[PDB]
């Protein structure tokens, strides 16, 4: 069930006295005319969300509703605020109460306090750990629904509990309908009378007339046209564009090489002047060991480097762990040494099917003795491995590829190919053309760009058009529609009907009359 909240849910935002003044404040208020869930207590006490604050109201004739429970689990496992009003004694506790499956009243505590015809409205919000309670009691004569009217709720209690409250439940006296609303960060114009009592309010987002009233800081609007808010079309999706195939890098001939070199005579391949597509490392799940140092593989297709070096060799499983900075052993010290500040990735996979013979593959060698340890990235050119098909996993051959990334004070030719998306025309999008980003409408154009020209600019030096890197067509960039909202109204002494003018826009993005 739902009812009309009308103008309920306005409370004093602070403890400041004001009079004969209209004060504009932004706080968590109940939006005007919003829907609040209507519960009944006749012939129904569910747990409701708390979100960012809850508006509560009830109508009484026999004091059926006597308390509230606020918390997260309500099962003695966490702290839960308990408020009980029995006859003449208001009781507030924050103990870890063990509540029944259906709490009701018949006819490690850190705080304790002891003190239809009646409408009792409440607001419960938690700001930086402070549980603020507002309320107002007024006589009413209405059973069916909430009375219509306006009444401000004064603060009464402020408990610095610091408790994360996400759910709440009501308490009924069994031998009383209640409403639950939610607060939003709306701006309200509050009217303070000569006695400092709030007598009216304007919700600055209910409708264009309320926006006009807030703009003029008045509850009366003179006849005329007022500018109250700027209209701006929002983008719907992003567009990422890179060439389909600019230039790839020969990573295939490094990993899928027919034959590999020994670890002492490790082979180095230089990668320069090509877009580095690392998706062959992501897709290919045929890798046994994949460890990176100094850089992350996910954030690698969007990062440039001056040069990339691909070192490849063959070792056994017990030695794969030695291909890392700060490692020691025959391979690290005598065959292949990585510096302590190495920035790259180490990849290895079991190559027992390729680098093993029935009589033992002895073509892969390794340096056994040396008078000193190798310097980082040193190649000194011996004992033979000789792998067999029945070797243990630690003694089976492994093909290792070590990618190392350097960044010097020189131009970076190796960066990375980022995935492209489809292009959407005649819609407000957030586009990215070869790294140039912006927001605007992409349309077809008749601008004859020269083969070497990629971007266009207007007199103001802003981007006018771009050439699609995949299909050599020229697309115009028109910034997304924007302007202003003006409200055309006769004075509030005659009518509350208004007309809205959206300045310098078409009647598209928004009894509609198109004017210049």
């Amino acid at each position, epitope marked *: 069930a739902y009812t009309n909240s009308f103008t309920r849910g306005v409370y004093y935002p602070d403890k400041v006295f004001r009079s004969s003044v209209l004060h504009s404040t932004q706080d968590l208020f109940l939006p005007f005319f919003s829907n609040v869930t209507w519960f009944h207590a006749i012939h129904a006490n569910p747990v409701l969300p708390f979100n960012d604050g809850v508006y509560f109201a009830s109508t009484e004739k026999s004091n059926i509703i006597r308390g509230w429970i606020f918390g997260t689990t309500l099962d003695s496992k966490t702290q839960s605020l308990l408020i009980v009003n029995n006859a003449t004694n208001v009781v507030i506790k924050v103990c870890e109460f063990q509540f029944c499956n259906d709490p009701f009243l018949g006819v490690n505590c850190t705080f304790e306090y002891v003190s239809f015809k009646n409408l009792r409205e409440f607001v419960f919000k938690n700001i930086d750990g402070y549980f603020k309670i507002y309320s107002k009691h007024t006589p009413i004569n209405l059973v069916r629904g909430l009375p219509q009217g306006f009444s401000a709720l004064e603060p009464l209690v402020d408990l610095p509990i610091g408790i994360n409250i996400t759910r709440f439940q009501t308490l009924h006296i069994s031998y009383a309908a209640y409403y639950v609303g939610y607060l939003q960060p709306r701006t309200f114009l509050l009217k303070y009378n000569e006695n400092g009592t709030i007598t009216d309010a304007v919700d600055c987002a209910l409708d264009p007339l309320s926006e006009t009233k807030c703009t003029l800081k008045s509850f009366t609007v003179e006849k005329g046209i007022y500018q109250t808010s700027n209209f701006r079309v929002q983008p719907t999706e992003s567009i990422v564009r890179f060439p389909n195939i600019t230039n790839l890098c020969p990573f295939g001939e490094v990993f899928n090489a027919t034959r590999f070199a020994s670890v002492y005579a490790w082979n180095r391949k230089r990668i320069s002047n090509c877009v580095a597509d690392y998706s062959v490392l992501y897709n290919s799940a045929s890798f*046994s*060991t994949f460890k990176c140092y100094g850089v992350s593989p996910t954030k690698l297709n969007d990062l440039c480097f001056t040069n990339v070096y691909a070192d490849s060799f063959v070792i056994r*499983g*017990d030695e*794969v*762990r030695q291909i890392a900075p700060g490692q020691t*052993g*025959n391979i690290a010290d005598y065959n292949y040494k990585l510096p302590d500040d190495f920035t790259g990735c180490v990849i290895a996979w079991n190559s027992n099917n390729l680098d093993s013979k029935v009589g033992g593959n002895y073509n892969y060698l390794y340096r056994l003795f040396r008078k000193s340890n190798l310097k980082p990235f040193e190649r000194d050119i011996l004992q033979s491995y000789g792998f067999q098909p029945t*070797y*243990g*996993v*630690g*003694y089976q051959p492994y093909r290792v590829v070590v990618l190392s990334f350097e960044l010097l004070h020189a131009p970076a030719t190796v960066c990375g190919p980022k995935k492209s998306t489809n292009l959407v025309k005649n819609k407000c999008v957030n586009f990215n053309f070869n790294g140039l980003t912006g927001t605007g409408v992409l349309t077809e154009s008749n601008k004859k760009f020269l083969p070497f020209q990629q971007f266009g600019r207007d007199i103001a030096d802003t981007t006018d058009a771009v050439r699609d890197p995949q299909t050599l067509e020229i697309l115009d960039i028109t910034p997304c529609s924007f302007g202003g909202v003006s409200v055309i109204t006769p004075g509030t002494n005659t009518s509350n009907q208004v007309a809205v003018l959206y300045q310098g826009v078409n009647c598209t993005e928004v009894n509609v009359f198109q004017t210049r």
Partner: antibody, heavy 125, light 107 residues
Framework: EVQLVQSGAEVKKPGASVKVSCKASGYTFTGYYMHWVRQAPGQGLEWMGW????????NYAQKFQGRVTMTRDTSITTGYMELSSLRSDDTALYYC??????????????????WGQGTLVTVFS | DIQMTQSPSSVSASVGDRLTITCRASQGISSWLAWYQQKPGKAPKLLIYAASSLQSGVPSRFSGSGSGTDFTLTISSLQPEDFATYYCQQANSFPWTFGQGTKVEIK
């Protein structure tokens, strides 16, 4: 048959050292690590360290670092565990065990299998 | 280091019973867990590795399950020769560590 056969039980005085041997047969000796695990009166199992018989490298549990030495003699496919400065709570059953590799969990080679029969070392005067 | 907690410490069961033994790791070890059986006077023997893989030659009434921190050794149909102490062991990180063991007795 793959088997690990250990040397016989010994009594050693507190402060002395003991050297237990583990002769391997029936498999490629340099192709598997040899680990040592001991079992004290309260039958808990306690890993001590490993030796790589191919490279000669070792790695010891921090509890025994500075007090244990693991070695091997490939020519007779035997591993050794020497524990020095023996104390009363070093009285235990000492096991050698074969482990194929320390990377891939998914293979049966890469767990303790098989084990030696154990060597009871009693530390007493 | 990774602590392995086994439960129960002891269990008495009848021939033909289904028996479950649990092992909890102090942190995630994926599937890097094994189960060993130690019969009286004998060295431990690998039963289950990689949490759920059956060691060759081991009777299939011994099975394992679990991943992460919680692991279970199951004996689906207890036999008199299953009188033994059972140990879990993690291989995720050195030092490799064992549970305290579960003693199985036969009613």
């Amino acid at each position: 048959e793959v088997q690990l056969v250990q040397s016989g039980a010994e009594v050693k005085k507190p402060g002395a050292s003991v050297k237990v041997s583990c002769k391997a047969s029936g498999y490629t000796f340099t192709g598997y690590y040899m680990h040592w695990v001991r079992q004290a009166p309260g039958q808990g199992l306690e890993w001590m360290g490993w030796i790589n018989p191919n490279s000669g490298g070792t790695n010891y549990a921090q509890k025994f670092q500075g007090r244990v030495t693991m070695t091997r003699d490939t020519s007779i496919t035997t591993g050794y565990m020497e524990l020095s400065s023996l104390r009363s709570d070093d009285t235990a059953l000492y096991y050698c065990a074969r482990v194929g590799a320390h990377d891939y969990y998914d293979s049966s080679d890469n767990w303790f299998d098989p084990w030696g029969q154990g060597t009871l070392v009693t530390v007493f005067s | 280091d990774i602590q392995m907690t086994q439960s129960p410490s002891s269990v008495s069961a009848s021939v033909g019973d289904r028996l479950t033994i649990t092992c909890r790791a102090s942190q995630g070890i994926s599937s890097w867990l094994a189960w060993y059986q130690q019969k009286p006077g004998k060295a431990p023997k690998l039963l289950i590795y990689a949490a759920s893989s059956l060691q060759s030659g081991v009777p299939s009434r011994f099975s394992g399950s679990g991943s992460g921190t919680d692991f279970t050794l199951t004996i689906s149909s207890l036999q008199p020769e299953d009188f033994a102490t059972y140990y879990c062991q993690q291989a995720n990180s050195f030092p490799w560590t064992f549970g305290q063991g579960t003693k199985v007795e036969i009613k």
